[PDB]
Design an enzyme around this catalytic site. Structure first.
Site, mmCIF file in Angstrom:
data_model
loop_
_atom_site.group_PDB
_atom_site.id
_atom_site.type_symbol
_atom_site.label_atom_id
_atom_site.label_comp_id
_atom_site.label_asym_id
_atom_site.label_seq_id
_atom_site.Cartn_x
_atom_site.Cartn_y
_atom_site.Cartn_z
ATOM 1 N N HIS A 191 34.471 33.912 42.272
ATOM 2 C CA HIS A 191 35.879 34.186 42.553
ATOM 3 C C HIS A 191 36.535 33.208 43.524
ATOM 4 O O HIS A 191 37.768 33.183 43.607
ATOM 5 C CB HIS A 191 36.027 35.594 43.129
ATOM 6 C CG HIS A 191 35.669 36.681 42.170
ATOM 7 N ND1 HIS A 191 36.207 36.762 40.903
ATOM 8 C CD2 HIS A 191 34.859 37.758 42.308
ATOM 9 C CE1 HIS A 191 35.742 37.846 40.301
ATOM 10 N NE2 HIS A 191 34.914 38.461 41.127
ATOM 11 N N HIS A 199 33.251 41.452 36.306
ATOM 12 C CA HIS A 199 34.577 40.946 36.628
ATOM 13 C C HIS A 199 34.825 39.593 35.973
ATOM 14 O O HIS A 199 33.893 38.813 35.738
ATOM 15 C CB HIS A 199 34.768 40.835 38.144
ATOM 16 C CG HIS A 199 34.573 42.142 38.848
ATOM 17 N ND1 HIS A 199 33.341 42.553 39.307
ATOM 18 C CD2 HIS A 199 35.429 43.164 39.096
ATOM 19 C CE1 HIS A 199 33.450 43.760 39.836
ATOM 20 N NE2 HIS A 199 34.707 44.154 39.720
HETATM 21 O O1 LIG Z 1 31.958 42.306 42.172
HETATM 22 C C1 LIG Z 1 33.006 41.660 42.232
HETATM 23 N N1 LIG Z 1 33.261 40.574 41.496
HETATM 24 O O2 LIG Z 1 32.219 39.783 41.014
HETATM 25 C C2 LIG Z 1 34.100 42.052 43.160
HETATM 26 C C3 LIG Z 1 34.614 43.330 43.325
HETATM 27 N N2 LIG Z 1 35.577 43.289 44.309
HETATM 28 C C4 LIG Z 1 36.779 44.049 44.415
HETATM 29 C C5 LIG Z 1 37.781 43.636 45.284
HETATM 30 C C6 LIG Z 1 38.921 44.407 45.431
HETATM 31 C C7 LIG Z 1 39.067 45.581 44.719
HETATM 32 C C8 LIG Z 1 38.074 45.984 43.847
HETATM 33 C C9 LIG Z 1 36.929 45.223 43.688
HETATM 34 N N3 LIG Z 1 35.682 41.898 44.773
HETATM 35 N N4 LIG Z 1 34.691 41.157 43.980
HETATM 36 K K LIG Z 2 32.349 38.068 33.559
HETATM 37 ZN ZN LIG Z 3 31.528 41.585 39.702
#
Ligand SMILES: O=C(NO)c1cn(-c2ccccc2)nn1
Ligand SMILES: [K+]
Ligand SMILES: [Zn+2]
Ligand SMILES: [K+]
Length: 400
Positions: free
Chosen positions: A141, A178
């Protein structure tokens, strides 16, 4: 050989974040408890000759001012005093806040993943290893000047940049729950890095991209990179079989048309049915065949030098359960050597974390996609046409 990134200092740093805790230690110690380490080539994390060389490596993608801020954040969190208002504003300008907070090792922690994935890319480039695994990396990310989703430095982008700069083409496959937005964005204008993310998307779900953007449209790259960014958003609840059938033909089509020099796989474990996200219902089962193991087996069948990275995964024992099986499967497929894994967790330092049943299987009882397949097939044809690539359309169409 199959390489895997570890080291005593590496392990300490990968276990220093508030969010991921000791997850890396559980992963590597489960792999060790199953007697896999003798089968693997240890790849040591990259270290540099000077601060200037380190900055040169990281600012191949990130801005100098962002790296400066991240280093300052660590320094500030190593003093007792509160941040000044000016320093809070500075960190806010890089999103070094909220879900990406500071902590005393935030720079060393983020940098360590970069060190590991760059070392992994180098081991593939010099052909020391056919595949290299880095369960301390996969932070998809992070952006040029922005932290995001507890990703501070994008080790994946930096690894891929080292690969493409070694007619080199890289296929990036992102299996995390994600959308892999940071890697997609970094290579949005580059036809030579084709990105493909399968993920959940729905209104309000992080990070919001990787889906429909007048019938709204799928963006897929720009400039000479048009049609080079691929996405498959999936509804919540999908199981191993439907996820495998959804991505299987796409993976094969991408390999046939792109003929990549390297594959980089992000294997975030948050699609597991037991992840606290509780969105998808994938397993680590290996007879219902784990979608993860299905995809990794297929990718490895291409015999292309491959980088396997970690990522998300907030159930630490079940993440170790999955990645241990990924690691065993990689040894089997690369070396042609059977890896027998007992269904019971072996005794070791973290045995108590796997209670109450101490088994390797996670504790779980198990139209839209057709339209995505037609859309993705047309985009692949458009990519091939734009980039003068030749392939029989009907061998590819037959896959679907
Ligand atoms: O696991 C993840 N991505 O690979 C993740 C999940 N996060 C997340 C951030 C804000 C709200 C909900 C979820 N931030 N990164
Ligand atoms: K993915
Ligand atoms: Zn993730
Ligand atoms: K691209």
């Amino acid at each position: 050989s199959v390489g895997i990134v570890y080291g005593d200092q590496y392990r300490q740093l990968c276990c220093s974040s508030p969010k991921f805790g000791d997850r890396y230690a559980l992963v590597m110690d489960l792999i060790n408890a199953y007697k896999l380490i003798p089968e693997l080539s240890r790849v040591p994390p990259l270290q540099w000759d000077s601060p200037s060389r380190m900055y040169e490596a990281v600012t191949a993608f990130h801005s100098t001012e962002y790296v400066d801020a991240l280093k300052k954040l660590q320094m500030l969190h190593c003093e007792e005093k509160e941040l000044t208002a000016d320093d809070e504003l500075l960190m806010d300008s890089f999103s070094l806040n909220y879900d990406c907070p500071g902590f005393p090792s935030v720079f060393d922690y983020s940098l360590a993943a970069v060190q590991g994935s760059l070392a992994a890319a180098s081991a593939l480039i010099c052909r020391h290893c056919e595949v290299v695994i880095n369960w301390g990396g996969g932070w998809h990310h992070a952006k040029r000047s922005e932290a995001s989703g507890f990703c501070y430095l994008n080790d994946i982008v930096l690894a891929i940049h080292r690969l493409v700069s070694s007619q080199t083409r890289v296929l990036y496959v992102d299996l995390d729950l994600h959308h892999g937005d940071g890697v997609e964005e970094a290579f949005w204008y580059s036809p030579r890095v084709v990105t493909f993310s399968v993920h959940h998307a729905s209104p309000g779900f992080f990070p919001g991209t990787g889906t429909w953007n007048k019938l709204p449209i799928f963006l897929n790259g720009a400039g000479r990179g048009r049609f080079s960014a691929f996405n498959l958003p999936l509804e919540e609840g999908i199981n191993d079989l439907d996820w495998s059938n959804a991505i299987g033909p796409i993976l094969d089509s991408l390999n046939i048309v792109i003929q990549p020099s390297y594959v980089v796989v992000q294997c975030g474990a948050d699609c597991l049915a037991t992840d606290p996200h509780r969105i998808f219902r994938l397993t680590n089962f290996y007879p219902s065949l784990s979608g993860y193991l299905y995809a990794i087996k297929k990718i490895l069948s291409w015999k292309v030098p491959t980088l396997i990275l970690g990522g998300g995964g907030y159930n630490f024992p079940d993440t170790a359960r999955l990645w241990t099986r990924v690691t065993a499967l990689t040894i089997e497929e690369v070396k042609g050597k059977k890896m027998t894994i007992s269904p019971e967790i072996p005794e070791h330092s973290y045995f108590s974390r796997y209670g109450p049943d101490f088994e390797l299987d996670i504790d779980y009882f198990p139209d839209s996609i057709q339209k995505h397949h037609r859309r993705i097939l047309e985009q692949l044809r458009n990519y091939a046409d734009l980039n003068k690539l030749i392939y029989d359309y009907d061998q590819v169409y037959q896959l679907y």
